[PDB]
C-alpha cells in the first residue's frame, strides 16, 4: 500500500522523521523530480523478494536534497538524519510548493541545530532538551553562548527555487 | 579521443564586476561536465556538476549553463575571495577523463 | 571522515616510488565508492592517472604508458600507487580522492565527480 505513503496529507519534520513497516507505478511516473537508487536497479526490483521494506518520510529544503546520500555531510546529515555507508534502497523527491506554503510563512516544520554529538545511522532524537551551552548551567537564553536547540523554516509562497519545500521518502530493503 | 579548449587564458576584473568563462568540447557530451576552483597551494573543490547543478554549500552567485559542445560559468558579483584558478573537467563514460587548461583571475 | 597520506619526500633518480592513502572513521569495503589518483606538475594543470573500483577492476589513462599501478591491501584497508624507475619528470604533488556510484530511474549506471580530497604529498628526485 504505497498510496498511504506517497499521497498522505500530514508529513513529519526532519528531526522527527516517521517510519513505516511493509513498483512499476513508481519508476514509470514522471512527476518525481529526483529518483536515485543504490545497490540495486529499479527495473530489476520485480525479480527479487525481501522480508522487510521500510518507508521513511519527511520534508526538507530544496537545497538540502543532496545531503540525503551515503557519505554526505552537513547540518541535516550530522544532526537530523543519517544513512549508512552501505545503504541499499532508493531516494524519491518532488516539489511541493503548492502545499506547505502559506502567506507570511509556515514556521511549522523544524530542524535541529547546535547538537553536541553526531548521530549514528538510523536513529532519531525528538525530545527538546536543556539548551546547549558551555560550562555554566543554563535555564533560559540570557547565557550569551546558550541557544535553543531547534529552528523553524520560513516557507513562503514566493522564494528562490532552492528555498522551496520538497517532500522526500526513502525506501529500504533487507532480508 | 575527446578534447577541450578553454578561453580566455587570463582574465582581469575588479570587485563587483561580471565574469564569464567558456569551456568547449571536441565532440558532443550529454552534459557530463564539472567545474573546480583551486587556491594557491591547496586542494581543489567542486562548484558545479552536470553543467547546470549547483553544489551544496557554495554561494548562490555562481551559475552555469550549456550543453552539447559549449558551456559557460558565470559569477554575478565578484567578492574578494573569488580570485583563483578555475578548471573544467568531463567524465563521459566512453572516453578517458581529462581536465582543462585553467584560467586565472586577478584584481584590476 | 578524513584522508591521510604517507610517502617519501626524496627519491633517487632511478628507483621505485611508493605512496599510500587511508581513511579514518569509515571503511574501504563498500560497493558504493571509487578511488582515483591525480597529480600536478609545478606551475601547471592537473592530470588524471586512473580509477579503481570495488571488486578490483581498474581503468588507466591511455596517454600515459601504463607505468603506474593501483591496488588495495585488505590486510590493512589501504590503497597505494606504484611507479618504478622514476625519472626527472616525476616531481609533482599527488592526490587521492573518492566518489559515488548510483543507478538511474531508467536502469543505467551513473557516476558522481570527486568530493573528498587528500592533503597531497610532495616528492623530489635526488641525485
Residue numbers in the entry:
A (entry chain A): 337 to 358, 365 to 517
B (entry chain L): 1 to 95, 95A, 96 to 107
C (entry chain H): 2 to 35, 35A, 35B, 36 to 82, 82A, 82B, 82C, 83 to 100, ...
What's the paper's own text on this?
Here we report the characterization of a potent neutralizing antibody (N3-1) identified from a COVID-19 patient during the first disease wave. The spike protein trimer is a metastable molecule in which the three RBD domains can adopt ‘up’ or ‘down’ conformations. To investigate this unique binding mode, we determined a cryo-EM structure of N3-1 Fab bound to SARS-CoV-2 S-ECD to a global resolution of 2.8 Å. We observed that two N3-1 Fabs bind to a single trimeric spike with one Fab binding to RBD in the ‘up’ conformation and the other Fab simultaneously engaging two RBDs: one in the ‘up’ conformation and one in the ‘down’ conformation.
We also performed focused refinement on the Fab bound to the single RBD in the ‘up’ conformation. Superimposition of two focused maps reveals that both Fabs make the same set of contacts with respect to RBD-up, with an RMSD of 0.7 Å over 380 Cα atoms. Furthermore, superimposing the N3-1 Fab bound to RBD-up structure with an apo spike structure that has two RBDs in the down conformation shows clashes, indicating N3-1 only binds spike with two RBDs in the up conformation. For the RBD-up interaction, contacts are made by the Fab H-CDR1, H-CDR3 and L-CDR2, which together bury 824 Å2 surface area. H-CDR3 residues Tyr98, Phe99 and Arg100a pack against a hydrophobic pocket formed by Tyr369, Phe377, Lys378 and Pro384 on RBD-up, which are highly conserved between SARS-CoV and SARS-CoV-2. This pocket is barely exposed when RBD is in the ‘down’ conformation and is part of the shared epitopes targeted by SARS-CoV and SARS-CoV-2 cross-reactive antibodies CR3022 and COVA1-1629. Lys378, from the upper ridge of the pocket, forms a cation-π interaction with Tyr98 of H-CDR3, and its amine group is expected to form a salt bridge with Asp100h of H-CDR3. In addition, main chain atoms of Cys379 and Tyr369 form hydrogen bonds with Phe99 and Arg100a from H-CDR3, strengthening this primary Fab binding interface on RBD-up. Furthermore, the sidechain guanidinium of Arg408 on RBD-up has polar interactions with Tyr49 and Glu55 from L-CDR2, which along with H-CDR1, constitutes the secondary binding interface on RBD-up. Ser373 and Ser375 do not directly interact with N3-1, however, the orientation of the flexible loop appears inverted in BA.1, causing the occlusion of the conserved hydrophobic pocket that H-CDR3 residues Tyr98, Phe99 and Arg100a pack against.
